[PDB]
Design a protein around this nucleic acid. Structure first.
Ligand SMILES: [Zn+2]
Lengths: 198, 48, 116, 661
RNA sequence: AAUUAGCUCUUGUGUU
């Protein structure tokens, strides 16, 4: 079994480093200087370094040449315990959700309609907006009359409103958000949010 | 560290985790350590 | 074999028989390097959606298929070099599994994830 | 600085190159008068800058050549003219200041006092001044005995070639006290020491007699060889060059795990780190061998007591760096940071294969903002690591009374750490006669460490020694690489800025010729100093910056060269053409520095100390202009200072800067 | 009733 080593790298850019190493090895396999790495591991949450499986640290250093992502770990590498091999390879794992990005991060969103297209789903959410008064905030009930009075980008359909950010609201935002842009498992609300929505 | 040991338990990132935690706790009460990097904020200034 | 290498990091799928990380665009235009003799992925998008799912975790860059222990651990010593997802959650359709069984292929799930 | 050092520093930067790449050469710096702006370029005046809290600075423009070279031989040498870099502040009344050559009426029309000396910067509307720092002379072998170590003697030698980004490297050749007398070397960039014989073998001198000839020049008095015997005997298992290279590389900062890496690291540190002033070229081992031989020879002479140890307080051994060298020191690092930034940007934008626009690549604030911060806060170094380097180089100009400003514009700072129990640096050395005021010094915790110039003191600005080398070579001087080592003993060595170059047989004629040339200012400029040692057959020539000197009248046999004609022509000065510079040109007065001042013999006054009386000297060479010129600015307003007790003169020099006026 | 660090300069102790 070839030894395993840790190579330091920039955090967050571990996915494409393996692809670039593949390209290097495939392009160099016909040349007189082939890459001698036996495998490369970049787990889901391991960040800042990548595991390399090769017979010697000399092979690692010779093969990882030309890759800028690992320049921090080019000169120094640490030894991966052999008893930790399996430790490398294990991974552990009308609803309510919470959005992941934007200004609406980490707030309750009630799944109103589930679209069978499996790209976006309908969510009712409390607008965190300033009603086009401050921007050239606390979760508060949407005000249709105030957003009609302040003007700007507004399309009115009685209880329906299309406003800044192409936001669709009724009576309360009702808009489509991606399934991967929300967390569909692990909300478990309390009674206060139910009133809002042993 | 708590969320790492909750699920991951990689047992090797844990070593560096506890090492850095020990360093932070030690420097919180003693910034002048023999042969250790000093604690500084985003100014280059050692802490008090 | 540079063809196994995906062209980008957008919308990757993995086999439930190979767990081979690859774009859906390459799964339709190019297809799997080891499932093409058995399931014929090249030429159908819906068949790619059924065969391969995007719910995969971690990537391993299998470089030398005959010279690595991780391949023996993941039962991919006899599969081609390339990018391999550590574990894929899901099951292939009953029809696909039965067709593989009739053709001499044992369906061994790649779902090695710890289920709490 | 502005005229020469910036151009030299910008060109001396190495080319930056990087799937094709570019060339990106920098040349021909451009600079303008200060100007602010949205707005049109309008000349910003110092008074307006002082009132609006602006910064009196001028932009810097440089010519760039971008040449991307790829497959198929299609390269484009696109040249960008007058590319903006950043703003450099200008000290008032410089050749690039708006108040240059303007008359009294011209300045008064501008709300500027014609009596204002200039000589300060305006940063953020505050008037800053750079206190001239002092430090030890570089490229000179200095032998000191310290009693707090294992070494009986230690011939330290700092070295720096010419304003290079590499920090100055120090060579320590030291003799243990304790067989006995184990001569060792403490090389830079190497953690541990090494015996000298190993180094000499490493340079490529296996032949033992060759090493002895380089180290010892006299082969009839067997004392130097007696002391070097133990050192020679210690190095007996290393005979070949490469084993010595491995030996030296075994102690490096990164010891290569293989022997080849150790050899390459050792040859690198030998040919590019140790002794850079003599040269870090492809091959300089022949001259470096001679220089180390001379260093060990001086150490042996110290051991014999034939040559007394050098003194650390003697300003013949110290250099005073003014605004010029300090600003150049800052600019080296700032330019390197700019180059790293643009290189990183270009590299990041050539991975995608797109063409990068250098106008967007260069970040202007790298040069301007750092220089502004360092001048404002006085922390002389990088902003992120300011605590590492010195502080208080820049101080707010003290406008309390005119004498206060004049005193504060001529101030020297010794960087000896305060709160020190040492008392030697604080004392008044004999060499401060006519150079530093003997009465003006702070009374606080920094007594004797901060000083002031004498009235007629001048500080050499620095000049290239190449004309000196050419003149010296084309005369009877013989170069160092082509001499029989048997001829060294009966000969006189020649040093230029410390680099032992060549040899000579008759030094008296050489010195007389050099004196005539310096008097006529044909090839040797006035600030160049030539010193001859009689006991040790040595002649040293210095042209570098930082040396402190003063004018002195010349005596030919027993009468001054100044005569009634000069005084008559000078009395009618400011009318026809005639001035002090012409007085120097006729070879009547001369600039003497403190190192040459050892070999000179002064007459305080002509009539009193040159007439015929009871014979005391009868062989004067120079005469003082006026002895009261030894005093500084603040001390020269005291009436009858030679009738008081000296501490009272010091107190007056202190309190004259606080008088209302 | 509106802040802290750092740096520099300066005052008194330089009696005999
Ligand atoms: Zn497959």
């Amino acid at each position: 079994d070839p030894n395993l080593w840790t190579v330091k790298c920039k955090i967050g850019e571990e996915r494409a480093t393996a692809i670039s190493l593949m390209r290097k090895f495939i392009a160099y396999q016909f040349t007189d200087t082939p890459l001698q790495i036996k495998s490369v591991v970049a787990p889901e949450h391991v960040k800042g370094y990548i595991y390399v499986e090769a017979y010697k640290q000399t092979h690692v250093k010779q093969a990882i040449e030309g890759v800028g992502n690992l320049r921090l770990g080019y000169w120094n590498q640490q030894m991966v315990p052999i008893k930790e091999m399996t430790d490398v390879l294990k991974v552990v794992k009308k609803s309510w959700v919470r959005l992941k990005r934007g200004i609406y991060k980490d707030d309750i969103a009630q799944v109103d309609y589930v679209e069978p297209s499996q790209n976006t789903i309908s969510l009712k959410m409390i607008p965190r907006i300033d009603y086009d008064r401050i921007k050239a905030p606390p979760q508060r009930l949407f005000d249709a009359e105030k957003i009609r009075s302040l003007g700007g980008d507004v399309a009115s359909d009685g209880d329906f409103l299309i406003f800044e950010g192409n936001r669709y609201s009724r009576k309360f935002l009702f808009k489509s958000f991606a399934m991967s842009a929300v967390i569909t498992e692990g909300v478990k609300p309390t009674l206060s949010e139910l009133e809002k929505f042993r | 560290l708590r969320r790492n040991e909750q699920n991951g338990a990689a047992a090797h990132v844990i070593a560096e985790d506890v090492k850095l935690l020990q360093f932070h706790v030690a420097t919180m009460v003693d910034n002048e350590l023999p042969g250790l990097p000093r604690a500084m904020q985003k100014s280059g200034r050692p802490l008090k | 074999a540079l063809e196994t290498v995906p062209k980008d990091l957008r919308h990757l799928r993995a086999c439930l028989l190979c767990s081979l990380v690859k774009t859906i665009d390459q799964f339709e235009y190019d297809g799997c390097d080891n499932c093409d003799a058995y399931l014929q992925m090249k030429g159908n998008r819906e068949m790619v959606y059924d065969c391969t799912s995007s719910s995969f975790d971690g990537i391993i860059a299998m470089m030398s298929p005959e010279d690595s222990w991780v391949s023996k651990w993941q039962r991919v010593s006899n599969f081609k070099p390339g990018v391999y997802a550590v574990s894929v959650t899901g099951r292939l359709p009953q029809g696909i599994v039965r067709e593989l069984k009739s053709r001499g292929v044992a369906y061994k799930s790649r779902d090695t994830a710890i289920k709490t | 600085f502005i005229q020469m050092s910036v151009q030299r520093i910008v060109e001396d930067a190495p080319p930056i190159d990087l799937p094709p790449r570019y060339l990106l050469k920098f040349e021909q710096i451009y600079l303008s008068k200060p100007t602010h702006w949205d707005g049109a370029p309008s000349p910003m005046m110092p008074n307006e800058a002082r009132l609006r809290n602006l910064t009196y600075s001028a932009p810097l423009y440089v010519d760039i050549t971008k040449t991307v070279i790829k497959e198929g031989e299609e390269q484009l040498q696109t040249q960008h003219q007058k590319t903006f870099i950043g703003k450099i502040p200008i000290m008032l009344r410089s050749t690039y200041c708006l108040l240059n050559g303007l008359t009294d009426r011209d300045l008064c029309e501008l709300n500027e006092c014609p009596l204002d000396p200039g000589g300060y910067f305006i940063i953020n509307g505050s008037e800053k001044v750079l206190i001239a720092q002092e430090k030890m002379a570089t490229n000179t072998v200095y032998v000191f005995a310290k009693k707090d170590s294992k070494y009986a003697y230690t011939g330290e030698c700092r070295s720096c070639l010419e304003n290079s980004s590499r920090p100055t490297s120090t060579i320590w050749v030291s003799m243990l006290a304790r067989i006995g007398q184990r001569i060792v070397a403490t090389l830079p960039y190497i953690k541990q020491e090494v015996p000298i014989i190993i180094v000499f073998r490493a340079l490529g001198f296996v032949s033992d007699r060759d090493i002895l000839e380089h180290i010892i020049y006299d082969f009839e008095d067997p004392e130097m060889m007696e002391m070097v015997k133990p050192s020679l005997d210690e190095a007996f298992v290393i005979q070949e060059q490469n084993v010595a290279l491995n030996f030296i590389g075994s102690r490096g900062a990164k010891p290569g795990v293989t022997k080849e890496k150790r050899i390459k690291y050792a040859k690198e540190v030998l040919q590019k780190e140790m002794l850079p002033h003599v040269g870090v070229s492809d091959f300089c081992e022949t001259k470096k061998a001679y220089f180390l031989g001379y260093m060990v020879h001086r150490l042996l002479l110290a051991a014999l007591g034939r040559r007394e140890l050098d003194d650390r307080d003697h300003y013949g051994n110290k250099r005073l760096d003014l605004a010029g060298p300090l600003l150049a020191f800052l600019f080296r690092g700032m330019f390197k940071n700019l180059l790293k930034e643009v290189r990183i940007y270009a590299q990041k934008f050539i991975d995608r294969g797109k063409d990068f626009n250098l106008e967007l690549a260069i970040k202007t604030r790298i040069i301007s903002d750092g220089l502004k911060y360092s001048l404002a806060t006085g922390n002389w170094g990088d902003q992120k690591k300011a605590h590492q380097a010195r502080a208080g180089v820049s101080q707010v100009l003290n406008r309390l009374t005119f004498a206060s400003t004049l005193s504060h514009l001529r101030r020297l700072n010794s960087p000896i750490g305060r709160d020190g129990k040492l008392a030697k640096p604080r004392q008044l050395h004999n060499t401060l006669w006519g150079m530093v005021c003997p009465a003006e010094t702070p009374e606080g915790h920094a007594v004797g460490l901060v000083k002031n110039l004498a009235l007629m003191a001048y500080i050499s600005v620095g000049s290239q020694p190449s004309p000196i080398l050419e003149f010296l070579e084309e005369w009877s001087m013989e170069n160092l690489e082509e001499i029989s080592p048997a001829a060294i003993a009966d000969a006189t060595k020649i040093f230029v800025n410390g680099c032992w170059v060549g040899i000579h047989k008759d030094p008296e004629q050489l010195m007389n010729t050099l004196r005539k040339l310096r008097r006529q200012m044909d090839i040797i400029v006035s600030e160049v100093s030539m010193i001859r040692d009689i006991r040790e057959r040595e002649i040293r020539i210095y042209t570098d910056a930082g040396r402190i000197c003063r004018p002195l009248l010349i005596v030919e046999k027993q009468k001054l060269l100044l005569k009634k004609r000069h005084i008559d022509q000078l009395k009618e000065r400011e009318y026809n053409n005639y001035s002090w510079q012409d007085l120097v040109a006729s070879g009547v007065v001369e600039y003497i520095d403190t190192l040459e001042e050892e070999t000179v013999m002064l007459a305080m006054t002509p009539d009193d100390l040159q007439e015929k009386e009871v014979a005391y000297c009868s062989t004067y060479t120079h005469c003082e202009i006026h002895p009261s010129m030894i005093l500084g600015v603040c001390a020269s307003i005291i009436p009858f200072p030679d009738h008081n007790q000296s501490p009272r003169n010091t107190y007056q020099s202190a309190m004259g800067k606080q008088a209302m006026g």
